[PDB]
């Protein structure tokens, strides 16, 4: 049976790029019978990436067992609630990630390669180099895009020196001008006007279990926070519906200005006091400004984890 | 600040060797201010290893915070209950291990290098090579000893092809004949007659939390199982005391004949039905013979994990 390689639910560019690239690396370098798949359709930014390099989106699955798989390799995630529905029924052969670890356990030893760098694609690319496996233009393009996507063109505080070193290498392999391509790709993911309120709050959203509470943290990239706030009423309605249908304790939406590097936080839930403590602010009409925030893994999750536990 | 590098409670040769070696690697490759420390004194096997290569036992600590450390690097373990007492109060900067993952979580991203190989020392050695950092005779000796210890001289089912590949290389760097040295160090850890019953059951023992139950799994290396069983009365008394003192639901002792690769399982607790299901045998007078069993991580933990969750 093939070993399925995939990123998290609501995959982003890095999730798609890292799983596609690692599935290939695992075949060439480790002789594993892998297959890259996805848990969701590409969102707009990734659609731009796939079209630019001429790569088909990995097929979407809903059950690892239904595919006949016995083993899986996770990229860009490790928390079970962010993975395939029946993740508990298959063996986790390996994990390549750059996120915090939680709600993850195995009965047996496994392979894990985690680094606190800008993207999982960055880790995968460096693994290509260490194993002397040639990187095609298409794979370079997808990995480069994952890196650019997750670090907002190397300016996010999650950007590691090693990310800055490999970006130009990947751009060369991908046949693109790093800044020219990067800016175009990032802009492709800021067209929120084409999305309904219910769609926008689930484009890039993950669930975190904080002290027994299921907290949904969503993020959207924009070039104008004010414009998004003009739709506050409809967004709040969508959020309330999401909370009711999924049983979340709280919903935190990051409206991220990727040009100026700040996020307006729109939150609704039963633990707003914990949200305010985490962000050192006071919500007014369900929102407040979080200066300098662009990263969920570095500027939202650690803080919420701490506030919910104390 | 000082980053402490250490193995699990009741450290064995691999725990001591891998942490000693990794602390050096981290300092040499990145200039990190690391310090290898231990959570306990070396067992008799490791004492032989340390004296053989002229290395002092890493100093023992009881609290990471008491040492002024804000960050730690764990080797040979990841489960919090097997780590430093205040592991939840410090940041886990990195982990190098070859065990299953459980009871481990972080608020922030981190470094993790896990591989299902024979020892953590094996992983550390290959990391030295990946970083182009030369290995001294003493560090080679400690890492080789960790590998020999955890795989019983490369004959345990946990032995990986990569372990067999690096063994001769490490032996040459350590200046020893692999078989001659291996037999000598392994023998040094089989003197059980001189240990009290209370000492014996805690030489090499780890706690696993299975479905809310704290199960203690200890192991001792011997050349004569029957000889150890002559002391069953006092050993059981020590086990009952340990169960009472620590609130364990069950205690499993592996009496391992390292010459013939078999283990007698002596178990006492509230879930013997789950223990019998895990090993597919019947306990008589609290014990049963398990042919071919020598590995806790491969032949005990996965099986108990499954039976306790059934
Ligand atoms: Mn992602
Ligand atoms: Mn990512
Ligand atoms: Mn160990
Ligand atoms: Mn080990």
Coordinates of C-alpha atoms and ligand atoms in Angstrom, one line a residue:
Chain A
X1 CA 0.0 0.0 0.0
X2 CA 1.2 3.5 -0.8
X3 CA 2.3 5.8 2.0
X4 CA 0.1 8.9 1.8
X5 CA 1.8 12.2 2.3
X6 CA -0.3 15.2 3.1
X7 CA -0.7 18.6 4.9
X8 CA -3.4 19.8 7.2
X9 CA -7.1 20.5 6.6
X10 CA -7.6 23.8 4.7
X11 CA -4.2 23.4 3.2
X12 CA -2.2 26.5 2.3
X13 CA 0.6 26.9 -0.2
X14 CA 3.2 25.5 2.2
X15 CA 1.0 22.5 3.0
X16 CA 0.5 21.7 -0.7
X17 CA 4.1 22.5 -1.7
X18 CA 5.8 20.6 1.2
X19 CA 3.7 17.4 0.8
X20 CA 4.1 17.4 -3.0
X21 CA 7.8 17.9 -2.7
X22 CA 8.4 15.5 0.1
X23 CA 6.4 12.7 -1.5
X24 CA 8.9 12.9 -4.4
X25 CA 11.9 13.2 -2.2
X26 CA 10.9 10.1 -0.1
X27 CA 10.5 8.1 -3.3
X28 CA 13.9 9.1 -4.8
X29 CA 16.0 9.3 -1.6
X30 CA 14.4 6.7 0.6
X31 CA 12.8 4.4 -1.9
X32 CA 9.4 4.7 -0.3
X33 CA 6.2 4.1 -2.2
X34 CA 4.6 7.5 -1.5
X35 CA 1.7 9.5 -3.0
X36 CA 1.0 13.1 -2.3
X37 CA -2.6 13.9 -1.5
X38 CA -4.5 16.8 0.0
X39 CA -7.3 17.3 2.6
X40 CA -8.8 20.2 0.7
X41 CA -8.9 22.2 -2.5
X42 CA -6.1 24.8 -3.0
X43 CA -7.2 28.3 -2.0
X44 CA -6.6 31.3 -4.3
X45 CA -2.9 31.9 -3.5
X46 CA -2.0 28.3 -4.1
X47 CA -4.2 28.1 -7.2
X48 CA -1.9 30.9 -8.6
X49 CA 1.2 28.9 -7.7
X50 CA -0.1 25.7 -9.3
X51 CA -1.1 27.5 -12.5
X52 CA 2.2 29.4 -12.6
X53 CA 4.4 26.2 -12.5
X54 CA 1.9 24.0 -14.3
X55 CA 1.3 21.5 -11.5
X56 CA -2.1 19.8 -10.9
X57 CA -3.4 20.1 -7.3
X58 CA -3.0 16.9 -5.3
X59 CA -6.2 14.8 -5.2
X60 CA -8.4 15.3 -2.2
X61 CA -9.1 12.5 0.2
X62 CA -11.3 12.2 3.2
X63 CA -10.3 8.8 4.7
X64 CA -6.8 7.4 4.7
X65 CA -8.3 3.9 5.3
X66 CA -10.7 4.3 2.4
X67 CA -7.6 4.8 0.2
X68 CA -6.2 1.5 1.5
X69 CA -3.3 3.2 3.3
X70 CA -1.8 1.8 6.4
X71 CA 0.9 4.4 6.9
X72 CA 1.0 8.2 6.4
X73 CA 3.6 11.0 6.5
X74 CA 2.3 14.4 7.7
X75 CA 3.8 17.7 6.5
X76 CA 3.1 21.1 7.9
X77 CA 1.2 19.8 10.8
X78 CA 1.1 17.2 13.7
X79 CA -2.0 17.9 15.8
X80 CA -4.5 15.1 15.1
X81 CA -7.5 17.4 14.9
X82 CA -5.9 19.2 12.0
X83 CA -5.3 16.0 10.1
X84 CA -7.3 13.4 8.2
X85 CA -10.4 12.3 10.0
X86 CA -9.2 8.7 10.6
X87 CA -5.6 9.7 11.6
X88 CA -5.9 7.6 14.7
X89 CA -6.5 4.5 12.6
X90 CA -3.3 4.6 10.6
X91 CA 0.4 4.6 11.5
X92 CA 2.2 7.9 11.4
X93 CA 5.4 6.9 9.6
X94 CA 6.9 10.4 9.7
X95 CA 6.4 14.1 10.2
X96 CA 8.1 17.1 8.7
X97 CA 6.9 20.3 10.3
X98 CA 7.7 23.8 11.8
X99 CA 4.8 24.2 14.2
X100 CA 4.3 23.6 17.9
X101 CA 3.6 20.0 19.0
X102 CA 0.3 19.0 20.7
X103 CA -2.4 16.3 20.4
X104 CA 0.1 14.0 18.8
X105 CA 1.0 10.5 19.9
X106 CA 2.3 7.2 18.6
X107 CA 2.5 3.7 19.9
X108 CA 5.8 3.1 18.0
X109 CA 9.0 5.0 17.3
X110 CA 8.8 7.2 14.1
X111 CA 10.7 9.7 11.9
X112 CA 10.3 13.4 12.8
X113 CA 12.0 16.3 11.3
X114 CA 10.8 19.6 12.9
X115 CA 12.6 22.9 12.8
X116 CA 11.5 26.3 14.0
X117 CA 12.0 27.9 10.5
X118 CA 9.8 29.8 8.2
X119 CA 8.1 26.9 6.3
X120 CA 8.0 23.1 6.0
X121 CA 9.0 23.6 2.4
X122 CA 12.3 25.0 3.6
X123 CA 13.0 21.9 5.6
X124 CA 12.1 19.7 2.6
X125 CA 14.3 21.6 0.2
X126 CA 17.3 21.4 2.5
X127 CA 16.7 17.6 2.7
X128 CA 16.8 17.5 -1.1
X129 CA 20.3 19.0 -0.9
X130 CA 21.5 16.8 1.9
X131 CA 20.5 13.7 -0.1
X132 CA 21.8 15.2 -3.4
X133 CA 18.5 14.8 -5.1
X134 CA 18.0 17.1 -8.1
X135 CA 15.2 19.7 -7.7
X136 CA 13.0 20.3 -10.8
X137 CA 11.7 23.7 -11.8
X138 CA 8.2 22.6 -10.8
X139 CA 9.2 21.3 -7.4
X140 CA 11.4 24.4 -6.8
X141 CA 8.5 26.6 -7.6
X142 CA 6.1 24.9 -5.2
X143 CA 8.7 24.9 -2.3
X144 CA 9.7 28.5 -3.0
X145 CA 6.0 29.5 -3.0
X146 CA 5.5 27.7 0.4
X147 CA 8.4 29.6 1.9
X148 CA 7.3 33.0 0.4
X149 CA 3.7 32.3 1.5
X150 CA 4.5 31.4 5.1
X151 CA 7.0 34.2 5.6
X152 CA 5.4 37.0 3.5
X153 CA 8.4 37.1 1.3
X154 CA 10.9 36.7 4.1
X155 CA 9.8 39.5 6.4
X156 CA 7.7 37.6 8.9
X157 CA 9.4 37.2 12.4
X158 CA 9.2 33.4 11.7
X159 CA 11.8 33.9 8.9
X160 CA 15.0 32.1 9.8
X161 CA 18.5 32.9 8.4
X162 CA 18.4 29.6 6.6
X163 CA 15.2 30.7 4.8
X164 CA 16.9 33.8 3.5
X165 CA 19.8 31.7 2.3
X166 CA 17.7 29.2 0.3
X167 CA 15.1 31.6 -1.2
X168 CA 17.4 32.9 -4.0
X169 CA 18.6 29.3 -4.7
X170 CA 15.0 28.2 -5.1
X171 CA 14.1 31.3 -7.2
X172 CA 17.0 30.4 -9.5
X173 CA 15.8 26.8 -9.8
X174 CA 12.2 27.9 -10.3
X175 CA 13.2 30.4 -13.1
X176 CA 11.8 33.4 -11.3
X177 CA 12.8 36.8 -9.9
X178 CA 12.3 36.3 -6.2
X179 CA 10.7 39.7 -5.3
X180 CA 8.8 40.1 -8.6
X181 CA 7.2 36.6 -8.2
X182 CA 6.9 36.8 -4.5
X183 CA 4.9 40.0 -4.6
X184 CA 2.6 38.7 -7.3
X185 CA 2.0 35.4 -5.6
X186 CA 1.1 37.1 -2.2
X187 CA -1.2 39.6 -3.9
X188 CA -3.1 36.7 -5.4
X189 CA -4.2 35.6 -2.0
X190 CA -5.6 39.0 -0.9
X191 CA -8.7 39.1 -3.1
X192 CA -11.2 38.8 -0.2
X193 CA -14.0 40.7 -2.0
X194 CA -14.6 37.6 -4.2
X195 CA -15.3 35.5 -1.1
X196 CA -18.5 35.3 1.0
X197 CA -18.2 35.9 4.8
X198 CA -18.7 32.2 5.5
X199 CA -16.0 31.2 3.0
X200 CA -13.5 33.8 4.1
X201 CA -13.5 32.7 7.8
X202 CA -12.6 29.1 6.7
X203 CA -10.0 29.7 3.9
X204 CA -7.1 29.3 6.3
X205 CA -8.3 28.1 9.7
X206 CA -7.1 25.6 12.2
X207 CA -8.5 24.3 15.5
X208 CA -6.4 24.2 18.6
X209 CA -7.4 22.4 21.8
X210 CA -6.6 24.8 24.6
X211 CA -7.2 23.3 28.1
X212 CA -10.1 21.3 26.8
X213 CA -11.5 24.1 24.7
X214 CA -11.7 23.9 20.9
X215 CA -10.5 27.3 19.7
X216 CA -10.8 28.0 16.0
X217 CA -8.1 30.4 14.7
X218 CA -8.6 31.7 11.2
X219 CA -6.4 34.1 9.1
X220 CA -7.0 36.1 5.9
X221 CA -4.4 38.1 4.1
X222 CA -5.4 41.7 3.0
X223 CA -3.8 44.9 1.9
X224 CA -6.5 47.0 3.6
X225 CA -7.9 46.1 7.1
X226 CA -10.4 49.0 6.9
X227 CA -12.1 47.5 3.8
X228 CA -12.5 44.1 5.5
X229 CA -14.0 45.8 8.7
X230 CA -16.7 47.3 6.5
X231 CA -18.0 43.7 6.3
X232 CA -17.9 43.2 10.0
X233 CA -21.6 42.5 10.5
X234 CA -21.6 39.7 7.9
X235 CA -18.3 38.3 9.2
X236 CA -19.6 38.2 12.8
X237 CA -22.8 36.4 11.6
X238 CA -20.7 33.8 9.8
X239 CA -18.5 33.3 12.9
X240 CA -21.5 32.9 15.2
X241 CA -22.8 30.3 12.8
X242 CA -19.5 28.5 12.7
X243 CA -19.3 28.4 16.5
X244 CA -22.8 27.0 16.7
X245 CA -22.3 24.3 14.0
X246 CA -18.9 23.2 15.2
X247 CA -19.1 23.6 19.0
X248 CA -16.0 25.9 19.3
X249 CA -15.5 27.6 22.6
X250 CA -14.0 30.6 20.8
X251 CA -13.3 31.9 17.3
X252 CA -10.4 34.1 16.6
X253 CA -10.0 35.7 13.2
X254 CA -6.8 37.4 12.2
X255 CA -7.3 40.0 9.5
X256 CA -3.7 40.4 8.4
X257 CA -2.3 43.4 6.6
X258 CA 0.6 41.7 4.8
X259 CA 1.9 45.0 3.5
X260 CA 2.3 46.8 6.9
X261 CA 2.5 43.6 9.0
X262 CA -0.3 44.0 11.5
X263 CA -3.5 42.1 12.2
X264 CA -6.9 43.2 13.4
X265 CA -8.3 40.6 15.7
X266 CA -12.0 39.8 15.5
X267 CA -13.0 37.4 18.2
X268 CA -16.2 35.9 19.6
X269 CA -16.6 33.2 22.2
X270 CA -16.9 32.3 25.9
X271 CA -13.3 33.1 26.8
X272 CA -12.8 36.6 25.5
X273 CA -11.0 37.5 28.8
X274 CA -8.4 34.9 27.9
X275 CA -8.1 36.3 24.4
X276 CA -7.6 39.9 25.8
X277 CA -5.0 38.7 28.2
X278 CA -3.1 36.9 25.4
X279 CA -3.0 40.0 23.2
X280 CA -2.7 42.7 25.9
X281 CA -5.7 44.5 24.5
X282 CA -9.3 45.3 25.1
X283 CA -12.0 44.2 22.5
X284 CA -14.5 46.9 21.4
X285 CA -17.4 45.6 19.4
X286 CA -15.5 42.2 19.2
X287 CA -12.2 43.5 17.8
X288 CA -8.9 45.1 18.5
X289 CA -5.6 45.9 16.8
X290 CA -2.6 43.5 17.2
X291 CA 0.5 45.5 16.2
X292 CA 3.2 43.7 14.2
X293 CA 1.3 40.4 14.2
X294 CA 1.4 38.4 11.0
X295 CA 2.2 34.9 12.3
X296 CA -0.3 32.5 13.9
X297 CA 2.3 30.0 15.1
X298 CA 4.5 32.7 16.7
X299 CA 2.2 35.6 17.7
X300 CA -1.1 33.9 18.4
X301 CA -0.9 30.3 19.3
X302 CA 1.8 30.5 22.0
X303 CA 0.0 33.4 23.7
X304 CA -3.4 31.8 23.6
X305 CA -1.9 28.5 24.9
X306 CA -0.5 30.4 27.8
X307 CA -3.6 32.5 28.6
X308 CA -5.9 29.5 28.4
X309 CA -3.7 27.5 30.8
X310 CA -3.2 30.3 33.4
Chain B
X1 CA 21.5 31.7 28.9
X2 CA 22.6 28.1 29.7
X3 CA 20.8 25.4 27.7
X4 CA 20.7 22.2 29.6
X5 CA 21.0 18.9 27.6
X6 CA 19.9 15.7 29.3
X7 CA 18.4 12.3 29.0
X8 CA 15.6 10.8 31.0
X9 CA 15.2 9.9 34.7
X10 CA 17.2 6.8 35.5
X11 CA 19.5 7.6 32.6
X12 CA 21.1 4.6 30.8
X13 CA 24.3 4.6 28.6
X14 CA 22.5 5.9 25.6
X15 CA 20.9 8.8 27.6
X16 CA 24.3 9.8 29.0
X17 CA 26.2 9.3 25.8
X18 CA 23.7 11.1 23.5
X19 CA 23.3 14.1 25.8
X20 CA 27.1 14.5 26.4
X21 CA 27.7 14.2 22.6
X22 CA 24.9 16.5 21.6
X23 CA 25.8 19.2 24.0
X24 CA 29.2 19.3 22.4
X25 CA 27.8 19.3 18.8
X26 CA 25.4 22.2 19.6
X27 CA 28.2 24.4 21.0
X28 CA 30.7 23.6 18.3
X29 CA 28.3 24.0 15.3
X30 CA 26.2 27.0 16.5
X31 CA 28.0 28.4 19.5
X32 CA 25.1 27.6 21.8
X33 CA 25.9 27.8 25.5
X34 CA 25.0 24.2 26.3
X35 CA 25.8 22.0 29.3
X36 CA 25.3 18.3 29.5
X37 CA 23.7 17.3 32.8
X38 CA 21.9 14.2 34.1
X39 CA 18.8 13.5 36.2
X40 CA 20.5 10.7 38.1
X41 CA 23.9 8.9 38.7
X42 CA 25.1 6.5 36.1
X43 CA 24.1 2.8 36.4
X44 CA 26.9 0.2 36.6
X45 CA 27.1 -0.3 32.8
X46 CA 27.5 3.4 32.2
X47 CA 30.0 3.7 35.0
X48 CA 32.2 1.2 33.2
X49 CA 31.8 3.1 30.0
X50 CA 32.6 6.5 31.5
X51 CA 35.7 5.2 33.3
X52 CA 36.8 3.3 30.2
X53 CA 36.9 6.4 28.1
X54 CA 38.0 8.8 30.9
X55 CA 34.9 10.9 31.0
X56 CA 33.3 12.2 34.3
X57 CA 29.7 11.5 34.9
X58 CA 27.5 14.5 33.9
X59 CA 26.6 16.5 37.0
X60 CA 23.2 15.6 38.5
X61 CA 20.4 18.2 38.6
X62 CA 16.8 18.1 40.0
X63 CA 15.4 21.3 38.6
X64 CA 16.1 23.1 35.3
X65 CA 14.9 26.4 36.8
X66 CA 17.1 26.0 39.8
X67 CA 20.1 25.8 37.4
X68 CA 19.0 29.1 35.9
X69 CA 18.0 27.5 32.6
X70 CA 15.2 28.9 30.4
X71 CA 15.6 26.3 27.6
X72 CA 16.5 22.6 27.5
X73 CA 17.3 20.0 24.8
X74 CA 16.1 16.5 25.5
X75 CA 17.8 13.4 24.3
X76 CA 16.6 9.8 24.4
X77 CA 13.1 10.8 25.6
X78 CA 10.2 13.2 25.0
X79 CA 7.4 12.1 27.5
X80 CA 7.2 14.8 30.2
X81 CA 6.9 12.3 33.1
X82 CA 10.3 10.8 32.1
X83 CA 12.0 14.2 32.1
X84 CA 13.2 16.8 34.6
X85 CA 10.6 17.6 37.3
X86 CA 9.9 21.1 36.1
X87 CA 9.9 20.3 32.3
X88 CA 6.5 22.1 32.0
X89 CA 8.1 25.3 33.3
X90 CA 10.9 25.6 30.8
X91 CA 11.1 25.8 27.0
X92 CA 11.9 22.7 25.1
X93 CA 14.4 24.0 22.5
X94 CA 14.9 20.6 20.9
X95 CA 14.5 16.9 21.1
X96 CA 16.7 14.0 19.7
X97 CA 15.0 10.6 20.2
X98 CA 14.2 7.1 18.9
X99 CA 11.1 6.4 21.1
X100 CA 7.4 6.7 20.6
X101 CA 5.9 10.2 21.2
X102 CA 3.4 10.9 23.9
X103 CA 2.7 13.3 26.8
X104 CA 4.7 15.9 25.0
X105 CA 3.5 19.4 24.0
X106 CA 4.9 22.8 23.3
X107 CA 3.6 26.3 23.1
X108 CA 6.1 27.2 20.4
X109 CA 7.8 25.6 17.3
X110 CA 10.9 23.7 18.1
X111 CA 13.7 21.4 16.8
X112 CA 13.0 17.7 16.7
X113 CA 15.1 14.9 15.2
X114 CA 13.5 11.5 15.7
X115 CA 14.3 8.3 13.9
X116 CA 13.1 4.7 14.5
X117 CA 16.7 3.4 14.9
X118 CA 18.6 1.6 17.6
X119 CA 19.8 4.4 19.8
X120 CA 19.7 8.2 20.1
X121 CA 23.5 8.2 20.0
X122 CA 23.3 6.8 16.5
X123 CA 21.2 9.8 15.5
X124 CA 23.6 12.2 17.2
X125 CA 26.6 10.6 15.5
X126 CA 25.0 11.0 12.1
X127 CA 24.2 14.6 13.0
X128 CA 27.9 15.2 13.7
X129 CA 28.6 14.0 10.2
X130 CA 25.9 16.1 8.7
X131 CA 27.4 19.2 10.3
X132 CA 31.0 18.2 9.4
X133 CA 32.1 18.2 13.0
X134 CA 34.9 15.8 13.9
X135 CA 34.2 13.2 16.7
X136 CA 36.8 12.8 19.4
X137 CA 37.8 9.4 20.8
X138 CA 35.9 9.9 24.0
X139 CA 32.7 11.1 22.3
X140 CA 32.9 8.2 19.8
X141 CA 33.3 5.9 22.8
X142 CA 30.2 7.2 24.6
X143 CA 28.1 7.2 21.5
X144 CA 29.2 3.7 20.5
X145 CA 28.5 2.5 24.0
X146 CA 25.0 4.0 23.8
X147 CA 24.4 2.1 20.6
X148 CA 25.8 -1.2 21.9
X149 CA 23.8 -0.8 25.2
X150 CA 20.5 -0.2 23.5
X151 CA 20.8 -2.9 20.9
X152 CA 22.7 -5.5 22.9
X153 CA 25.7 -5.4 20.5
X154 CA 23.5 -5.0 17.4
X155 CA 21.4 -8.1 17.9
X156 CA 18.2 -6.5 19.2
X157 CA 15.2 -6.3 16.8
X158 CA 15.5 -2.5 17.2
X159 CA 18.9 -2.6 15.3
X160 CA 18.6 -0.7 12.1
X161 CA 20.8 -1.1 9.0
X162 CA 22.3 2.4 9.6
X163 CA 23.3 1.3 13.1
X164 CA 25.2 -1.7 11.7
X165 CA 26.9 0.7 9.2
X166 CA 28.1 3.2 11.8
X167 CA 29.2 0.7 14.5
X168 CA 32.5 -0.3 12.9
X169 CA 33.3 3.4 12.2
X170 CA 32.6 4.4 15.8
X171 CA 34.6 1.5 17.1
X172 CA 37.6 2.7 15.1
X173 CA 37.3 6.2 16.3
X174 CA 36.9 5.0 19.9
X175 CA 39.9 2.8 19.6
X176 CA 38.2 -0.5 20.5
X177 CA 37.5 -3.9 19.1
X178 CA 33.7 -3.8 18.7
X179 CA 32.9 -7.3 20.0
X180 CA 35.5 -7.3 22.7
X181 CA 34.5 -4.0 24.1
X182 CA 30.8 -4.6 23.6
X183 CA 30.8 -7.8 25.6
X184 CA 32.8 -6.2 28.4
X185 CA 30.5 -3.2 28.8
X186 CA 27.4 -5.3 28.6
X187 CA 28.7 -7.7 31.2
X188 CA 29.4 -4.8 33.5
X189 CA 25.7 -4.2 33.8
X190 CA 24.7 -7.7 34.8
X191 CA 25.8 -7.7 38.4
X192 CA 22.4 -7.9 40.1
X193 CA 23.3 -10.0 43.1
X194 CA 24.9 -7.0 44.7
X195 CA 21.9 -4.8 44.3
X196 CA 19.1 -4.6 46.8
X197 CA 15.6 -5.4 45.6
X198 CA 14.5 -1.8 45.8
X199 CA 17.6 -0.7 43.8
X200 CA 17.1 -3.4 41.2
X201 CA 13.6 -2.5 40.2
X202 CA 14.6 1.2 39.6
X203 CA 18.0 0.9 37.8
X204 CA 16.4 1.2 34.4
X205 CA 12.7 2.1 34.7
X206 CA 10.3 4.5 33.0
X207 CA 6.7 5.5 33.5
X208 CA 4.2 5.4 30.7
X209 CA 0.8 7.0 31.0
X210 CA -1.7 4.5 29.3
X211 CA -5.2 5.8 29.2
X212 CA -4.8 7.7 32.4
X213 CA -2.9 4.9 34.1
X214 CA 0.7 5.3 35.3
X215 CA 2.4 2.1 34.3
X216 CA 6.0 1.6 35.5
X217 CA 8.1 -0.5 33.1
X218 CA 11.5 -1.6 34.5
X219 CA 14.2 -3.7 33.0
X220 CA 17.4 -5.4 34.2
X221 CA 20.1 -7.2 32.2
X222 CA 21.1 -10.6 33.5
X223 CA 22.9 -13.7 32.4
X224 CA 20.6 -16.0 34.5
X225 CA 16.9 -15.3 34.9
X226 CA 16.4 -18.2 37.4
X227 CA 19.0 -16.7 39.7
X228 CA 17.1 -13.4 39.8
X229 CA 13.8 -15.2 40.4
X230 CA 15.2 -16.8 43.5
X231 CA 14.7 -13.4 45.0
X232 CA 11.1 -13.0 43.8
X233 CA 9.7 -12.5 47.3
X234 CA 11.9 -9.4 48.1
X235 CA 11.6 -8.1 44.5
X236 CA 7.8 -8.3 44.7
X237 CA 7.9 -6.5 48.1
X238 CA 9.9 -3.7 46.4
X239 CA 7.4 -3.6 43.6
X240 CA 4.4 -3.3 45.9
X241 CA 6.2 -0.5 47.8
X242 CA 7.0 1.3 44.5
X243 CA 3.3 1.0 43.4
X244 CA 2.1 2.4 46.7
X245 CA 4.8 5.2 46.9
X246 CA 4.2 6.4 43.4
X247 CA 0.5 5.6 42.7
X248 CA 1.3 3.3 39.7
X249 CA -1.7 1.3 38.4
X250 CA 0.7 -1.5 37.3
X251 CA 4.4 -2.4 37.5
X252 CA 6.1 -4.5 34.8
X253 CA 9.6 -5.8 35.3
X254 CA 11.5 -7.2 32.4
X255 CA 14.2 -9.7 33.6
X256 CA 16.3 -9.8 30.4
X257 CA 18.7 -12.6 29.6
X258 CA 21.0 -10.6 27.3
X259 CA 22.9 -13.7 26.2
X260 CA 19.9 -15.7 24.9
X261 CA 17.7 -12.7 24.1
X262 CA 14.7 -13.7 26.2
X263 CA 12.9 -11.9 29.1
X264 CA 10.8 -13.1 32.0
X265 CA 8.0 -10.7 32.7
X266 CA 7.1 -10.1 36.3
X267 CA 4.0 -7.9 36.6
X268 CA 1.8 -6.7 39.5
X269 CA -1.1 -4.4 39.3
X270 CA -4.8 -3.6 38.8
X271 CA -4.7 -4.4 35.1
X272 CA -3.1 -7.8 34.7
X273 CA -5.7 -8.8 32.2
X274 CA -4.4 -6.0 29.9
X275 CA -0.8 -7.2 30.5
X276 CA -1.7 -10.8 29.5
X277 CA -3.5 -9.5 26.4
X278 CA -0.5 -7.5 25.4
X279 CA 1.9 -10.4 25.6
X280 CA -0.6 -13.1 24.7
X281 CA 0.4 -15.2 27.7
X282 CA -0.8 -16.3 31.2
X283 CA 0.9 -15.1 34.3
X284 CA 1.6 -17.8 36.9
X285 CA 2.7 -16.5 40.3
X286 CA 2.8 -13.1 38.7
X287 CA 5.3 -13.9 35.9
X288 CA 5.7 -15.6 32.5
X289 CA 8.5 -16.3 30.0
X290 CA 8.6 -14.2 26.8
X291 CA 11.0 -15.7 24.3
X292 CA 12.9 -13.3 22.1
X293 CA 11.8 -10.2 24.1
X294 CA 14.6 -7.7 24.8
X295 CA 13.2 -4.4 23.7
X296 CA 10.9 -2.2 25.8
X297 CA 10.2 0.3 23.0
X298 CA 9.5 -2.4 20.4
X299 CA 8.2 -5.4 22.3
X300 CA 6.5 -4.0 25.4
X301 CA 5.3 -0.4 24.9
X302 CA 3.4 -0.7 21.7
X303 CA 1.6 -3.8 22.9
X304 CA 0.7 -2.3 26.3
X305 CA -0.4 0.9 24.6
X306 CA -2.8 -1.1 22.4
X307 CA -4.1 -3.3 25.2
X308 CA -4.8 -0.4 27.6
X309 CA -6.7 1.4 25.0
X310 CA -8.7 -1.6 23.8
Ligands
LIG1 MN1 0.4 25.4 6.2
LIG2 MN1 3.9 26.0 7.0
LIG3 MN1 17.8 5.6 27.4
LIG4 MN1 18.2 5.1 23.6

